[PDB]
Every structure is written in C-alpha cells, then in structure tokens.
C-alpha cells in the first residue's frame, strides 16, 4: 500500500507543531487564564454545597485548596 | 444469518409453542442445574430450550437460575400461599420435565379454552366504531341502509340545505 | 457484534438530520441587498447572476437568479427556495421568478 494517507497526517502534524511553536507565548497566557477560571468554577461549586445545606459560611476550618496550580 | 446456535429459539413462533401456563399460585421458579455431567443433560437442555418458552407464557413469574450449587439438578416453585414444590429432574429429559411441571402446576386445556372465550365477549360484532375496535364504523356500511353521503348524494328532500329553503 | 453487545448498545441512532439553508422550510422571504455575478468552477464558464439577500430570519445569504435577464434592485422583496446551483460553490438558494418584485422571464 502507498503512504498517501500517512503523508496527509504527516503534514497536518508538522503544521500543527509549527503553529504551536510560533504562538507558544500567547497560548501560555491563555492557558493561565483558563486555569484561573477553572479554580473559580471549582470554588463556586463547593460554596453552592454548604449554602444549599443551610450553612452561612464554610465549615469551621475549611480552606478550598488550589488544585490546578503547578505547585 | 441469525447469530448463535439454534436461532429458532429467538423467534416469536417458537416462543409461543410453550404449553406450560402456570396457575395463579406460582410466583417464583428457581432452576438449579449443573454445567457438566451426563445425568444433568436434560436439565441443561431444559434451560437452553424451554425456559424462554415458560417465561414467555408467564411474564410475571420470576425465574432465577443457579449453576453448580448442588450435586444434582432440581426445580423449586414458590406458591403464593407459602408452599414450596420441589421437583427432582436428574436423569429426566427436557421434554419429560416440561410434561411434569405442566401436570402439577399448569392450567389444563379446559381452563385455557374458557379464558379465550371470555375475551371474545369484549369485541361485540354489533358495535360500531373505529376499525381498531369494531368490524364496521357506521351503519351506512350495512347493505339496505341509507348509504354515506360521501359516496351517494342524498336526495334533495333529505338535505337541510333545501328543507330550510322551501320552508323559508 | 455479539448478541450481548447488541443488547447493551440498543437500536441504532440516526444522526440528527441537518437543516439546509432554508432551515427546513419550503421558501423564505428576503430583501435584496446587492446584485452581482459569480464565476462557476471549472470546467464551466459563465457570469451567473446572483444577489445577496437578508432573509426573514435575519441571516444574509447569496441567491442565484435563474432565467435570462432580471430587474432586481436593492431594497426589493423576493421569495427564495432551496436547491443548489451545481457549479456555483456556496450558492444554495434560488430566487422564485414571478413572486413579489421578481417577475417572470420575458419571452425571447
């Protein structure tokens, strides 16, 4: 069999890797922004739980951790 | 072709060929059989060929199977009164098993004939209505009666358009 | 697939039929925005008369004007139907000749 199907995928992958390399500083700023909104969306979900259960503040001694940071 | 061995089992014709219709007392039927052994061969064919036919005729009876729990195969029926009926099936063929349970817990041909007759009373031939429920929709379909105006226009004298015209 | 697998997956699910440019409607009312000509893709050669209309749904689309000669102008009302113009890529609507402001083709 010829490799024409492979060649189409080969060029797709080459152009994608080159695009990512050319815009890696913009994508890094976008990724940072998404992880922040992701952390906020997670904090809202936990706050919805204790508010709907009748509590006015988080359980005593609870601190929502940052589960999406590199550290 | 249809998948599996003996695909005839997965046809409505085959499933309706069961002759075992349990009495109203039967509530549960457990089947204990062994996967191997020459003396449990009839019980394996019973599970393979007949259980679908029994369940089809008795949709509300619970049927539960159990494999290799005891040395010999047997059936056990649980009745609504709390009575339990044990049936030893070791050495018997699947046809002898079907004939046995039919005799002790199946409705006879007389009881089944009567039930079918009481159903025919629900579709009275003299009633008029939709084809789904009645033979004829309107009396105009009966020969000799005044036919439907959609097929045979009524005389001008039998129409209100000209009764009111003459009267008015 | 085996009988167990077919039972577990259930009956097949047709892909939800996609609505065309008319959004599943016989015709649509439109307002002419501008007229122009389009070149067909090879091996055809012509200057096919088209127009851009604002459909009653708020969407703007290009429509082919069939027949020899038309008098459509901006701000005129037209009725558009389905049917793609085979050699005009992207043109999927056709003006109805003889309805609203678009009159019938003049004989010869």
């Amino acid at each position: 069999k010829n490799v024409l199907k492979i060649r189409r995928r080969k060029m797709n992958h080459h152009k994608y890797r080159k695009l990512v390399k050319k815009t890696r500083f913009l994508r890094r700023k976008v990724q940072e922004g998404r992880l922040r909104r992701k952390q906020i969306k997670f904090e809202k979900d936990l706050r919805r739980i204790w508010l709907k259960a009748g509590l006015k503040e988080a359980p005593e001694g609870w601190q929502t951790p940052k589960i999406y940071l590199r550290g | 072709p249809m998948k599996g061995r003996f695909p005839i089992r997965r046809t409505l014709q085959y499933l309706s060929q069961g002759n075992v219709v349990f009495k109203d007392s039967v509530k549960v039927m457990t089947v204990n059989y062994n996967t191997h052994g020459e003396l449990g061969e009839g019980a394996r064919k019973f599970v393979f060929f007949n259980i679908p036919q029994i369940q089809y005729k008795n949709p509300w009876v619970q049927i539960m199977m159990f494999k290799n729990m005891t040395p010999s195969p047997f059936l056990r029926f649980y009745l609504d009164s709390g009575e339990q009926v044990l049936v030893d099936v070791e050495t018997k063929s699947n046809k002898e098993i079907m004939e046995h349970i039919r005799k002790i817990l199946g409705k006879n041909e007389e009881t089944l004939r009567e039930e079918e007759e009481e159903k025919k009373q629900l579709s009275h031939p003299a009633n008029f209505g939709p084809r789904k429920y009645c033979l004829r929709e309107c009396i105009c379909e009966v020969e000799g009666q005044v036919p439907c105006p959609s097929l045979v226009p009524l005389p001008k004298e039998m129409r209100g358009k000209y009764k009111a015209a003459l009267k008015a | 697939a085996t009988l167990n697998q077919m039972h577990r997956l259930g009956p097949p699910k047709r892909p939800p039929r996609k609505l065309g440019p008319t959004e599943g409607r016989p015709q649509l009312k439109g307002v002419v925005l501008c007229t122009f000509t389009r070149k067909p893709k090879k091996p055809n050669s012509a200057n096919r008369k088209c127009c851009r209309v604002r459909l009653s749904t708020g969407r703007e689309a290009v429509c082919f004007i069939p027949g020899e000669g038309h008098t459509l102008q901006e701000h005129q009302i037209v009725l558009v139907e389905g049917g793609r113009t085979q050699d005009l890529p992207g043109v999927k609507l056709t003006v109805v000749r003889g309805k609203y402001d678009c009159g019938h083709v003049q004989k010869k």
Partner: protein
C-alpha cells in the same frame, strides 16, 4: 449474478433424487387441498422401515430477513409494490 444463478439452479435436488437418497416417500401437503397427502416421489429401490429421526428442535441457520418478515417487523415502502405482469 449470471454465473451464480446458473450454479444454484444446476445444483438443485429433485424430489426423486431426495427419495432415492433417503429411501423414503416424499409427501406433499397443500393448504388448498386440505390434509390430503400427495406422494410426489417414491424410492425406486427398497423402502426404509425406520422413520426419519424427528429432532425436537432443528439446528438450521435462519435468515433474519425471512424471520423479520414473518413477524411483521419488515417495513419497506419499496416491497410488495404493484408492477406489470412479468
């Protein structure tokens, strides 16, 4: 299609070939003739005395299209259409 058709039609077993192969009568049952048994072929050689074994359930492979049609589950706007006499 042509080559396959001629292969199938040329490799069919007549009723006389079936009677000779099994040494039994080939009896035909017609619904328009009621329960009247119609013998269509008899073995030219001796006639067996032992009946053909009656398997309670045949292990024959079924065609889903035939089964689906017999159960009224076959729905097609193109089947059973009226056509000119052929």
């Amino acid at each position: 299609l042509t080559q396959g058709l001629f292969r199938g039609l040329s490799r069919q077993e007549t009723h006389q070939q079936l009677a000779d192969k099994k040494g039994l009568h080939v009896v035909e049952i017609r619904e328009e003739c009621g329960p009247l048994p119609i013998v269509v072929a008899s073995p030219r050689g001796p006639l067996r005395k032992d009946p053909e074994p009656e398997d309670e359930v045949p292990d024959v492979k079924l065609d889903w299209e035939d089964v689906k049609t017999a159960q009224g589950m076959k729905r097609s706007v193109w089947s059973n259409l009226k056509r000119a006499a052929t």
